[PDB]
Ligand binder design. Sequence first.
Ligand SMILES: [K+]
Ligand code: NA
Length: 124
Amino acid sequence: PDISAKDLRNIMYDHLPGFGTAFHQLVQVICKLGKDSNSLDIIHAEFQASLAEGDSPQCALIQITKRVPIFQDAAPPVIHIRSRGDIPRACQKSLAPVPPSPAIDAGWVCVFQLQDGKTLGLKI
Ligand SMILES: [K+]
Ligand code: NA
C-alpha cells in the first residue's frame, strides 16, 4: 500500500482532539479492518478529500464507515478488558448497552467485554 496502517493511524491522530476518545478507537478499528481488506489507500484518499471539503475529522471517519465496503454491516471488534476502568476516560460517556447485531456503520465502534462477561458498547 502507498501508506501503512501505522502511518494512516498517525495521520488521523494528527487531526483528532484529545486522547483516548471514541474517535481514536474508531481510527484503530478502521486501520485494522482496512489493512485486512487492503483498503488503506482508499480510506486515506477519502479521509483527505473529506478534510479538503471542510468536514471535521470525526465526520470524515464516520463517512469512511459509511462508504468503504469492508465496514458495511461489519461487526465491531470485541475488546477484552479486566474492568470498566481499562476503558479510556474520554470513552466513559460513550458507553451503552449492546444490541443483538451491532454494526460499525451504525456507530458501534467496538464492544468492550469485561472478564465477568458483562459487555459495554462504544457508541457514536
Ligand atoms: K490529540
Ligand atoms: Na477525538
